[PDB]
Amino acid sequence: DSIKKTLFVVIALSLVCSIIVSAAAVGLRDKQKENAALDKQSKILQVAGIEAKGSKQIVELFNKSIEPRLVDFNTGDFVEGDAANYDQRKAAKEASESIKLTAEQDKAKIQRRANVGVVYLVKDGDKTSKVILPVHGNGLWSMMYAFVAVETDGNTVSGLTYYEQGETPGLGGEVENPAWRAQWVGKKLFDENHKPAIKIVKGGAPQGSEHGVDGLSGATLTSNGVQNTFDFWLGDMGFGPFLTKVRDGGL
Amino acid sequence: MSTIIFGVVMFTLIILALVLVILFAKSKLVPTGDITISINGDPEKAIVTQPGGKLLTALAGAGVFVSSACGGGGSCGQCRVKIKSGGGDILPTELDHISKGEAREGERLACQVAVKADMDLELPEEIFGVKKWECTVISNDNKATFIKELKLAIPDGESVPFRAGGYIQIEAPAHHVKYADFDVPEKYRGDWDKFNLFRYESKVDEPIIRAYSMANYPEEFGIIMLNVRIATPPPNNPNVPPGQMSSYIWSLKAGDKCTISGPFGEFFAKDTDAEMVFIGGGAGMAPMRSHIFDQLKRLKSKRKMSYWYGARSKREMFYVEDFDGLAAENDNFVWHCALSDPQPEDNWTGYTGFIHNVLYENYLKDHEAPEDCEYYMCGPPMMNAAVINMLKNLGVEEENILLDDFGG
Amino acid sequence: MEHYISLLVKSIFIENMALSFFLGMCTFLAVSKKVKTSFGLGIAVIVVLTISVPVNNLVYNLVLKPDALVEGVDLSFLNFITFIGVIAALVQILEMILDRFFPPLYNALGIFLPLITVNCAIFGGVSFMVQRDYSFAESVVYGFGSGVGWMLAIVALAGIREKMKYSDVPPGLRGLGITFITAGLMALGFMSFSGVQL
Amino acid sequence: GLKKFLEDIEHHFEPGGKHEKWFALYEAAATLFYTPGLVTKRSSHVRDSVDLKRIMIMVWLAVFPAMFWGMYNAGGQAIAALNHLYSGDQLAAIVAGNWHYWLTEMLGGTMSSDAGWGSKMLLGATYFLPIYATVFIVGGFWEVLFCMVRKHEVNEGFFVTSILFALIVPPTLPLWQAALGITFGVVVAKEVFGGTGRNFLNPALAGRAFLFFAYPAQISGDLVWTAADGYSGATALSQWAQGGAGALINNATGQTITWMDAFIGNIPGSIGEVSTLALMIGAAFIVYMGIASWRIIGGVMIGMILLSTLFNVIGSDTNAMFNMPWHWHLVLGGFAFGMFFMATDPVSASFTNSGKWAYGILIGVMCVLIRVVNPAYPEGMMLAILFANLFAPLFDHVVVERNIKRRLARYG
Amino acid sequence: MITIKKGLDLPIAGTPSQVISDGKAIKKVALLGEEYVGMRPTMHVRVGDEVKKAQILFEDKKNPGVKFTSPVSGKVVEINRGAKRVLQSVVIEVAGDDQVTFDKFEANQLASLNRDAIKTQLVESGLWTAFRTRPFSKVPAIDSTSEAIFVTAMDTNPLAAEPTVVINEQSEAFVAGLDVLSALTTGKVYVCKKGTSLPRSQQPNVEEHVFDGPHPAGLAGTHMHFLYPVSADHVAWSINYQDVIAVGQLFLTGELYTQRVVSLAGPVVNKPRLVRTVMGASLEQLVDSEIMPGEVRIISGSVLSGTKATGPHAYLGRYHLQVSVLREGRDKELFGWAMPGKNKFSVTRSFLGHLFKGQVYNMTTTTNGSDRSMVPIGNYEKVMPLDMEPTLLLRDLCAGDSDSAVRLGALELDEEDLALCTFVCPGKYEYGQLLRECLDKIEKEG
Amino acid sequence: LKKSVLAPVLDNNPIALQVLGVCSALAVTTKLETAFVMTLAVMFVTALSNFFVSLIRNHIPNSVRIIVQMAIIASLVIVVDQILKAYLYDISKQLSVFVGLIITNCIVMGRAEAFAMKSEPIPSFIDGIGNGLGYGFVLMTVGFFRELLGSGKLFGLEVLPLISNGGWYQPNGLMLLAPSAFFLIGFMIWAIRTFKPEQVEAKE
């Protein structure tokens, strides 16, 4: 009785528990994915300067106004693919679709870059108003991710948002301060030579400067990370070629 | 849909594989065999146990009974045994109680020796001689406002080989009791009616067992006397129900019969030929009478003995005839009594107050060498503590003090 | 081999399971009364973690990853049940294989060996291994290092508590509260490794 | 007459007196002025002259040179920075707006670049003294409260605790933050364990760590180490990391920090840490008297030198802290202050001669390790000491177990 | 040759001149009941009873068969008792010369006498109480034996008498006592001494050992630690040189020998010197007209480990060979804890006194401070020459952790061994009492 | 009778007396939202697991009783985790690994073994609810102070205006780190055992 009853009890309990667990797990995948997508869409709309309250409005406006696209970093022109679901973070891990940088190339200290990245085009009908570029780099405590919206001239920033960072709330966490993110509106990424020109200034930027942005107060080790990420992703190994194309066409 | 089938199948397979692995490992890593116990002398009366039985329970099933105060487990630690082999480690559950003693010879409580090993056991002789008897009540009469004397006739004309000051155990089945059935004499009805105690009732639905000391000494062959007090609800807390075994014994009458167990050995007097002092109060008359009679008549010794009893009132005296006769015929014995709370009908002119204070003021405060005497005491806790403190302030060492507790 | 040295050092110090992630606190606080018992429990935890993390890595990589079994199928929702079942089986096997049978050494722990299943440290370690996507050797090294770090923390706490025989703690704080405060103070000292990116 | 006055009011405080609850205060005040006048009741009928009062007063006196030089240096740094930034009417307006500055000028000092040592020390005092008074009063309140509630006599040690805590903070620390830090250090780390001689952590460093992790913006960065309004300037350890010996420039004066400047104490930083010469002069005394552990000091030095030389040998092409030699490690930051006065706390250290060496070596190793390979913080003495406090009892255990084995072998 | 490097020679003033002289007449002697650890007396005499020398006064309950006898012939005049009726003293007033007598032997038979005969003769005369047992410093049980008997032929206590001066007067008795011990022991007899010469016993199992260094070098505990480490399994007996002389006299002439030679010294003693007295002499009568005016404390034994001899305790102890006198210090000084002490002794270097080497101090009984917690500035390590962790052991004693103290080595110690640790404690702890409490717990529990 | 659901709150508090559930208390008490969600999840899991384990208490094979109990608990917590990911994604992202760790949370297994294995299903359910409330008491009390003094808000509502946005309060940075939880729990235990002396531990 012992062995037979033990096996019977375990089998029956496993059957019931597995039925419940599998049914519940398979019945909620769609909603879990919807929540995950809404989280990102809300931030993209926020940085794009479009307001949206509620999932229905977020989805409506994102579908109406945003057009994800894939870009090849080496050549800077658009490439075909499933941009709406492409996962750049995972794409960067695998050697099949990711390169490893060199000491003098890895200014942002990211250790790798995926071959193709996703950019979002903001549209006001059939025309394109601006491009949102996801960038990231290493801070003092964590890896910092941000969106930067560039206008159609390919030089002028219209917004910046850090949507993932783990710095100290009072010192390095100020990258998320609205008053500091508001300084980027109107700055120009490149100079008349078309070289990267964004400066993070320790002690504040000169009044009326079109390339300088105040550094974080008492957070030099994070201002350096911001400067490194920008001067990398604006270079030849990042969105440099793509922005060069944008400056005179392609978009 | 396919994911559901795969999830079900993999859940079941994983759980089943883990269970099967555990069972297979168990079948080879567990001894799964027989195990026995035996006295160190390896007599023919070996003991066979299941590998999952407690040592105390196994020994009780084998007939080797031991004292108990909780019906199982460790409550007081009186159930101690000696082990040579098998019991290769002592757990903190024996160091906690009773603490230390550093028994180099391997002593442990029998409530937690367990399990898997062929056990070598050593026990005292008294534990080998336990027997169970059925007795017939000769008399059951009141001698105080809450105390009876139960007299039992030993069956088949045999006499229990007990020692003065020892105790036996009574065993009774599940019973129900009501106090209106008691035949309380008119000498004690006043206080019962004062609190209307006849209204109380109690019951128990399992067999019960209790221990009692006997007021006789081994020269009174064939009969056992027990001074039993009835356990009533505390006067300040009438909420709780009364006791069971005392009520049952009070319910018994002459001609009835009850089943008892053999005696257990402890509280024996020392043989140092020193003066002995007995302090008693209330129900603690049985050990004192046993010791006094055994010392004076069976051993026929000339040691100096004195007995001091703290009585509530003259209405509560008994064995006065025996003690007076002993004090009148023997030049080496004397006995005194004091009334804790006398009442007018006593017409009392003797010692009053607590017995410890009486003894201090009259005998010990001017005694030559208190520490050289031996003190045997038994009574309520708030007499016992006072006596102990008094003796301590006189410098008496613990080895010369013997204290018996009925359980508070 | 410097990669594995870095991983081991990170696991022991820069990512101390007890005083950086704060897992296993129930036994960390209850059993740290004496250094010898703490050392025994730490050894047991080391063994269990080392045997557990690699096996769970194997099972996850073979049957639980997406497309691991059949293309287009994802059984990752069985992660918790698989992890806990493996851990429980391994510890129940340990109890029968070593402690109660050799040398024996069971009596030292008693109540505390069976409940190593619920030790949050092991489950958290396997969860972190899955999140980090280690190889087999990395899983072995990570498990060993995390167990060693947990043992280090518990032994240090036991040493402090033994040193506190001379203290005079308020009655309301004696025992559990003062131990909580002591662990809080230990956390401050262990915050020295925060900025290291090993 | 203080003697007979104290001896007359004595009866009001003994059990049953009208002031029985203030017995702790009465005893603390009376035995500060006069000695107890007691005799030996048993055992050894003659006793050593030393006592905890003298033990603590010697340590309290040992840091006076460091405190005075710290005040002078703080004043000089502040004045130099102010005159570097502002001039003329702008400087006058700046002075009129800060009570430190216009008090210094009211009491006969001058805030111009030609100020003397007197004015510089006065300006340093107007920063140091408020902090010290706040710390002293707030911590003494808690100590006396615990002693009254638990009905004990007030033990000694707070004199050392308060002064060290006041000396290991920047000159610009807010007073409410100082109060919170001392409250934490005294209550959580010392009093909850029974008081003096019964804790396991260092109270002053515990309070400093509380401040460090709770309000990092006021105890780190470029804005806190020089008491000049609007002045921003890094210090030596932060400069060496960004990096090399060529980055050590005193921007307020334009000169280059030299080893002698660092050794004497002409550099910004915590109030009392700067002067290695003064710290050594003070520590030599208490080491000679046998109150400080030369074994602990030697262990710290050994660990520091070993790890510094290892880093120097293996070298690095990116981290400039790999170049710093041991003699620069010695004079930069708060290494000397901690080594001499905070790593030698008898209660927090090991109780065995052979364990003290390991304790010191661990502290020395950890300090350099945090300085070099931890980019978050420029210095690591406080963290290293707090870390070694956790493992000192374990070294004691390791030593005592070997002793016990020797005993069991019938050779000890 | 063993050299002790860690210790302290206390530089107290009033050191005796090592020349023996007669003492003032003694008319009362007493036996002190509280100095025998673990003793519960049973009185065999009553006030007014006449006694003879070597007659039993009381017998121990907890150590059956051990007898304590009268040092002199007279009559009992007092039986002092204290709290909880503890016996303090049994006082006898000297009168007459009656005595009990025993057997006598030739000098060449002692080395071959029988062990049981030796034991019986020692027990009957009450001289069996000269021995003490490490651990627990109790009188040995009658039925027990020991492999190691330690003789202490050196004295390093401050103001102590020089053993060689006394021994040279009683060479034959000392050698006879050594011979008797050689037969009483089942192992070897260790004669611990300094570099100077002493009379020698010719028995193979009696051997001399030389110790050098500051004070702690002269203690039976140090000698045991270095020659025969003791524990629960291994037990050693200790006896001092004057008791050895007494044993030799006993077995040579058949009479109890109760003479003593003690040093009377101290800062307040006018003419420190060695004095001939009798066992249990009255210290009040002994130090009569020997001391300067003022309030003083009379101590039987060293200022390190003696007993305050006042009231019912004003008699020479059984195991004490000196008397010390010094002023009761009760002055209160302004900021005394902070002054630079040119006249203040200390084992540390915080006072100006240590700069004046060769200085001697008129020490008093002041406690230079108040009771406080223990801050380990490392003073204990400077005065403990044994292989132990003094700070850990002392904190175990303070905390009451008997089990840990036993592991750390408490069984090897006696109250005399922690006298210097008590001396140099900034917290003014008294460690002898704590050690005695821990040993009491350990002995009771097992 | 009510006492069975209220005793665990103060008389037999899990974290403060037993002691169980310390890990989640340390981890998830930096925001009242996460603390409250964890409290509810633990209540639900413990109550349901107690009910189900008691329902089949007479048939569990002694050999693998741990396996059976952990299977039930793991199934329940898996369902809870799926539901949280479906409907409370933002809070699930913050709870991270501690949702799964409910399986090894000592309270659930302790109650399942000690009580559910020897009691009727409805009493077991009530015991689970009471223990969950006792756990939530400590969780919410610690989270209150931590969140308030560390960020000036409760449940995300601004209560103390911050200086960084024009307010007057400067948040404490230590309240967002682990040691603050240890200190808070220690002082809470101190207060509880002051107001209920019977819980004071012996000297040694």
Ligand SMILES: Cc1cc2nc3c(=O)[nH]c(=O)nc-3n(C[C@H](O)[C@H](O)[C@H](O)COP(=O)(O)OP(=O)(O)OC[C@H]3O[C@@H](n4cnc5c(N)ncnc54)[C@H](O)[C@@H]3O)c2cc1C
């Ligand atoms: C060695 C030994 C010798 C003894 N000798 C004698 C002897 O010679 N004579 C003698 O009379 N007895 C003797 N006793 C005592 C005896 O064994 C019984 O304890 C006694 O007789 C009472 O038994 P009972 O069954 O009547 O009461 P019990 O049922 O044991 O107790 C009932 C009493 O307890 C109260 N009570 C019950 N439950 C509670 C509760 N939850 N809270 C509070 N109060 C409660 C009841 O109100 C009542 O007062 C001896 C005991 C021992 C161990």
Ligand SMILES: Cc1cc2nc3c(=O)[nH]c(=O)nc-3n(C[C@H](O)[C@H](O)[C@H](O)COP(=O)(O)O)c2cc1C
């Ligand atoms: C005893 C002591 C310990 C210190 N510990 C630390 C520390 O652990 N971390 C830290 O960043 N600064 C610490 N400091 C402060 C620095 O030593 C120094 O005063 C300050 O960082 C000045 O900047 P700099 O080091 O870049 O010159 C400590 C100071 C003292 C006196």
Ligand SMILES: CC(C)=CCC/C(C)=C/CC/C(C)=C/Cc1c(C)[nH]c2ccccc2c1=O
């Ligand atoms: C100070 C005074 C007049 C009264 C005490 C009342 C009070 C408010 C004290 C707060 C500071 C304090 C508790 C110091 C302890 C301590 C004392 C009292 N005397 C000391 C004396 C010498 C050396 C150290 C100490 C020491 O460290």
Ligand code: FES
């Ligand atoms: S049966 Fe209860 S203690 Fe033995």
Ligand code: FES
């Ligand atoms: S909740 Fe108990 S170990 Fe984590």
Ligand SMILES: [Ca+2]
């Ligand atoms: Ca990328």
